Amino acid sequence: HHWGYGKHNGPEHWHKDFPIAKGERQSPVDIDTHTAKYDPSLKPLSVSYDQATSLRILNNGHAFNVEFDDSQDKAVLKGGPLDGTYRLIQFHFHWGSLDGQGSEHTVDKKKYAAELHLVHWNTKYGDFGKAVQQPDGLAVLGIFLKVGSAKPGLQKVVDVLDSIKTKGKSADFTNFDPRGLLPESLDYWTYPGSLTTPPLLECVTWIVLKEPISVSSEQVLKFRKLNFNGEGEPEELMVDNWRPAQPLKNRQIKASFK
Ligand SMILES: NS(=O)(=O)c1ccc2oc(=S)[nH]c2c1
Numbered sequence: 010h011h012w013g014y015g016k017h018n019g020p021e022h023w024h025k026d027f028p029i030a031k032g033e034r035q036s037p038v039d040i041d042t043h044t045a046k047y048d049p050s051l052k053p054l055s056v057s058y059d060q061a062t063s064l065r066i067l068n069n070g071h072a073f074n075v076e077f078d079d080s081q082d083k084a085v086l087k088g089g090p091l092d093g094t095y096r097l098i099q100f101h102f103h104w105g106s107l108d109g110q111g112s113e114h115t116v117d118k119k120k121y122a123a124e125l126h127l128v129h130w131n132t133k134y135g136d137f138g139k140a141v142q143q144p145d146g147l148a149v150l151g152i153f154l155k156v157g158s159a160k161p162g163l164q165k166v167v168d169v170l171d172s173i174k175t176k177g178k179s180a181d182f183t184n185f186d187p188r189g190l191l192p193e194s195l196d197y198w199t200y201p202g203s204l205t206t207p208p209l210l211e212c213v214t215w216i217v218l219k220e221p222i223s224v225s226s227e228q229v230l231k232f233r234k235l236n237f238n239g240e241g242e243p244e245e246l247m248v249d250n251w252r253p254a255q256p257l258k259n260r261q262i263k264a265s266f267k
């Protein structure tokens with residue numbers, strides 16, 4: 010894999026190695042709030058993160074992932090548009106070089122400074138690798154980040170970034186509670202989509218929260234000090250690791266609220 014976010018290997022180039030990039034249910038997308046329809050049949054989302062077991066944080070060259078123990082139902086997402094139980098496996102963010110860009114999904118074309126993706130897989134498929142091969146294999150909870158007041162629950166992440174500056178570095182990250190990354194409201198929009206990075210598999214039920222969380226300028230500034238490169242290689246700041254909105258095609262975005 011040589012894909013990335015540069016001019017020579019960015020989103021415009023991905024289709025040559027991952028043809029599904031021009032598929033029928035690609036993500037992210039722009040959420041047109043006026044066109045999204047309230048669906049009375051949608052259920053309240055059920056986010057059960059009390060028993061979450063975080064293990065490690067890794068810089069994988071495109072973002073940093075906080076990984077969880079998913080060998081048991083410890084942190085799960087259920088309800089909403091989902092049927093079944095989805096286990097949290099990892100979370101990561103996409104962000105910009107400037108506060109005015111960074112999110113993958115947009116709301117009425119508005120771009121947020123960053124976007125958090127809490128990734129969950131459908132337990133009926135047994136493991137994550139099998140789940141990504143299914144249309145309903147994953148449920149990703151997307152949360153927008155706007156720059157304003159600091160998010161207390163995010164500080165432990167910000168403070169460990171110095172230890173995983175470059176690609177391939179990891180650090181112990183146990184006892185991190187992801188509940189501190191959520192906004193107050195769980196109102197959301199939902200639609201069928203895909204992974205936003207290669208392999209771009211069309212296996213995701215996207216659940217995007219309406220309420221952004223606020224993070225401080227200093228917190229996001231630290232995200233921008235990370236590197237896409239490995240140690241001992243020319244420094245390339247890890248910024249603008251977001252894919253732009255893709256064609257909605259034959260899909261409807263549904264709202265859980267009126
Ligand atoms: N993965 S990809 O985005 O299609 C892509 C784009 C440009 C590339 O140049 C080399 S060399 N490998 C590459 C892979």
Ligand SMILES: NS(=O)(=O)c1ccc2oc(=S)[nH]c2c1
Pocket residue numbers: 126128149203204205206207208
């Ligand atoms: N950016 S994202 O769509 O949330 C996402 C989530 C899980 C993933 O697993 C692989 S592999 N690529 C992924 C992209």
Ligand SMILES: [Zn+2]
Pocket residue numbers: 101102103126205
């Ligand atoms: Zn993501």
